[PDB]
């Protein structure tokens with residue numbers, strides 16, 4: 001996260017750190033708890049991930065230093081990538097992790113509500129991007145979870161900012177015209193959380209941008225409201 005500040009413990013209890021174990025253990029991506037055995041994240045996080053056996057989901061983490069060999073995690077039973085996914089820049093950048101065991105909800109770990117299909121028209125004015133990602137292009141994963149408040153950008157304005165790309169309504173953009181605050185390397189897969197009527201909603205999934213926090217280059221997020229039926233298809237299968 002660029003231009004962000006340290007989160008407080010329990011502030012974003014749906015935020016997870018997804019680690020890979022191959023060749024050595026390290027943070028791979030962010031993710032969000034959306035159900036008691038479900039993590040919503042970005043499809044591009046699994047580039048070159050041949051098996052769910054190398055994945056570890058850690059919830060209730062503020063500091064990466066809380067994670068050692070003796071730290072409990074959730075194993076991943078299954079990786080579900082959207083069928084239409086090709087690359088982050090073309091959209092459908094969404095995946096679900098079915099966990100091997102159930103998350104016990106509490107003040108340190110609980111789900112974030114999915115946006116309502118009826119609320120596709122609501123204007124979100126209190127949106128925050130969170131993660132342990134870089135503070136600038138050439139940096140390192142941060143110990144403490146960071147947060148940055150960022151305004152949503154219309155599809156029309158985002159399309160003007162990305163000449164040569166096709167910014168669809170299945171993407172949602174966020175950033176200041178002047179730049180300064182954004183997601184960066186290591187934040188992808190994490191949430192873009194917006195508070196509306198005292199309830200937090202998972203509005204976006206950190207996906208891509210041209211550089212980090214650049215002037216007139218908003219961050220591009222998967223527009224979660226457009227995938228609510230796909231999520232229910234995969235999580236509520238009979």
Ligand SMILES: COC(=O)Nc1ccc2c(c1)NC(=O)CCCC[C@H](NC(=O)/C=C/c1cc(Cl)ccc1-n1cnnn1)c1nc-2c[nH]1
Nearest residue numbers: 026027028045183184185186187188207208209211219220
């Ligand atoms: C010690 O552990 C370690 O260093 N781990 C570690 C470090 C870095 C990584 C990573 C793991 N994950 C990946 O490479 C897979 C995942 C690969 C893509 C991922 N993309 C982002 O996270 C976000 C991009 C992004 C999103 C928005 Cl909204 C705006 C600007 C963006 N950027 C443009 N340029 N940079 N960012 C990434 N992640 C990493 C490097 N790239």
